[PDB]
Design a protein around this ligand. Structure first.
Ligand code: COH
Length: 198
């Protein structure tokens, strides 16, 4: 199976070669990836980073951006995951096909985030913060990346304070999701690389 909801379905044709499986999978996830590139380009300070650093932040952060953007695919009440085809699958069925601890963690994250009930403008600005908070391992101009992050974070504080004047803790709660996203990224990358088709 292929229990990633970026796929159209978790069922894999055992006659198809691995190259063929991956290529099919790629027609499903590539449009989502390109959408993160387009989004990055609309963060004004992102264009002022070095070309190398833009590419590196996208490299390290795309997953974390997509995890925020697709948190709603995880329905903690119904205990279902919606794949990009529109089809829904139960957690039990997905556990049976090889999902495990990482799926559970994703439900946990998604439930807490989905819960905060962010507006679109709030979610959008948070997502920008997530992107520019990506792992700095490849980065050549660290101070420029931290400056953009600080800029976006102040903007986020100002927006949450306008929209939630008596609940400033929402701001802090969002920042606390950054290490959680990094943990999800870490574990997911292990699953990605350990993926075999036969
Ligand atoms: C919204 C969450 C999300 C995103 C954005 C995402 C984005 C991407 C992505 C982006 C281009 C790629 C190449 C992959 C690639 C993979 N993902 Co995901 N995955 C995600 C959630 C998951 C989950 C959940 C699983 C199964 C985890 C588990 O518990 O086994 C997963 C599993 C996988 C697997 C292993 C499947 C298996 O062993 O059956 C691969 C490969 N992937 N994933």
């Amino acid at each position: 199976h292929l229990v990633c909801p970026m796929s159209k379905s978790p069922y894999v044709d055992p006659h198809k070669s691995g190259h063929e499986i991956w290529e099919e999978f790629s027609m499903s996830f590539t449009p989502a990836v390109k959408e993160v590139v387009e989004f990055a380009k609309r963060i004004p300070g992102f264009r002022d980073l070095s070309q190398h650093d833009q590419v590196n932040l996208l490299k390290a952060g795309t997953f974390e951006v997509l995890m925020v953007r697709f948190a709603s695919l995880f329905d903690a009440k119904e205990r279902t995951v919606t794949f990009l085809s529109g089809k829904k699958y139960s957690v039990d069925d997905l556990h049976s096909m090889g999902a495990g601890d990482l799926l559970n963690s994703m439900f946990e994250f998604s439930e807490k985030l989905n819960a905060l009930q962010l507006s679109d403008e709030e979610m959008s600005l948070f997502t920008a913060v997530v992107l520019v908070s990506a792992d700095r391992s490849g980065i050549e101009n660290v101070n420029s990346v931290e400056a953009l992050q600080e800029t976006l974070i102040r903007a986020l504080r100002t927006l949450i304070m306008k929209n939630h004047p008596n609940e400033a803790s929402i701001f802090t709660k969002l920042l606390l999701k950054l290490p959680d996203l990094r943990s999800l990224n870490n574990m997911h990358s292990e699953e990605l690389l350990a993926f075999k088709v036969h």
